[PDB]
């Protein structure tokens, strides 16, 4: 789904079809470089998504003082310290699942058990 660029000249590659050999050949519209396509997938709309609750993590989230602290442990390092905080996505239907990030194992883990 990614947007490849011509290695000779960093420009947006477009799909165009072979006339007789029946293959998608990503030809550059700037220069004459051409490349066959790995998959017949071209375009993808994705009208439904549920993604974005997790990321935005820096390696020193716990360096900020404002995050609360708890005593549930990381289930890799067993250290009782932690940093917990809710979803990083905000829709009007995002969940009350929580995200728990530790400093010792430096790992993200949740509290869902379904």
């Amino acid at each position: 789904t990614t947007f490849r660029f011509c290695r000779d000249c960093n420009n947006m590659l477009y799909p165009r079809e072979d006339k007789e050999n029946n293959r998608l050949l990503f030809e550059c519209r700037t220069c004459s470089y051409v490349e066959e396509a790995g998959s017949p997938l071209v375009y993808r709309h994705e009208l439904i998504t549920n993604i974005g609750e997790t990321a935005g993590v820096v390696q020193d989230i716990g360096s900020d003082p404002t995050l609360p602290r708890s005593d549930r442990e990381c289930p890799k390092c067993h250290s009782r310290e932690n940093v917990f905080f809710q979803s990083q996505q905000r829709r009007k239907d995002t969940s009350m699942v929580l995200f728990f990030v530790c400093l010792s194992c430096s790992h993200i883990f949740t509290s869902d058990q379904k």
Binding site: P15, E17, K19, V42, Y43
Partner: protein, 48 residues
């Protein structure tokens, strides 16, 4: 019906210039074709 993933396969039939035509026809069939019910009526809920 009984397959694990319900699929539709469609093609344009006519006895270059495919992508934007097929994208517009895709957008049209998604935006226009009614299924059942009567339009300008939305979600419906049941009170006891």
């Amino acid at each position: 019906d009984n397959d694990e993933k319900l699929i539709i396969r469609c093609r344009v039939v006519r006895p270059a210039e495919e992508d934007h035509m097929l994208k517009k026809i895709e957008n049209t069939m998604l935006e226009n074709i009614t299924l059942r019910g009567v339009e300008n009526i939305e979600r419906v809920v049941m009170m006891k």
